Structures are given as structure tokens and as C-alpha cells.
Amino acid sequence: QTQKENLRKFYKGKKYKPLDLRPKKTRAMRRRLNKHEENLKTKKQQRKERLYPLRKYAVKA
């Protein structure tokens, strides 16, 4: 554990890590899009959402 924790500190922030240091989670979960390119939106899509946002309304009876 002391050896492995030293290696985790050595590669703290380097570009490439050993495969046994980088996280395991699940083979399918390692293939999914990460959190930055998951919510990339085009300019045609993000112009529509400033011009036409969903409004908060109510309808009286």
C-alpha cells in the first residue's frame, strides 16, 4: 500500500498513467463520453435556447 500510494502521487496530474493506476470502473463505463463532451452543444442548438427558453406559466381556471 505504501508503494502504490507513492505511485499515485508520482503520476498526480501527468498526461498518461499506468493502466493499473487509472480507474477500473467497468469496461463499458470506460467507453462512454466524459463529462465535458457529453454536454457540448452546437451553436445552432445553443442559439435556439437563448432565443426560445422554456417559460414558467400557469393557466387560470
Partner 1 sequence: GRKRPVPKGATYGKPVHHGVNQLKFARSLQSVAEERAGRHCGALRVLNSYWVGEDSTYKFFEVILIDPFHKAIRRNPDTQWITKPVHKHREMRGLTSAGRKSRGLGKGHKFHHTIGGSRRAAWRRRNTLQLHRYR
Partner 2 sequence: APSRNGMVLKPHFHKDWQRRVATWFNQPARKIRRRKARQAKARRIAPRPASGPIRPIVRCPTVRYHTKVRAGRGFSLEELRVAGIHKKVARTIGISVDPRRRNKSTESLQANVQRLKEYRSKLILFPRKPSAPKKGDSSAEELKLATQLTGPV
How far is it, in rounded angstroms, from Cα 45 to Cα 49? 7
State the Cα–Cα distance between residues 6 and 18, nearest whole angstrom: 13
Instruction: Choose, by CB under 8 A, the member of 19, 29, 40, 61 that binds partner 2.
Output: 61
Count of residues engaged in binding partner 1, rule: CB under 8 A? 9
Q: Binding of partner 1 at residue 26 (CB under 8 A)?
A: no
- From the CB of 10, what's the least distance to RNA, in Å? 13
Q: 19 near 7, Cβ under 8 Å?
A: no
Q: Which residues bind partner 2 (CB under 8 A)?
A: 48, 51-61
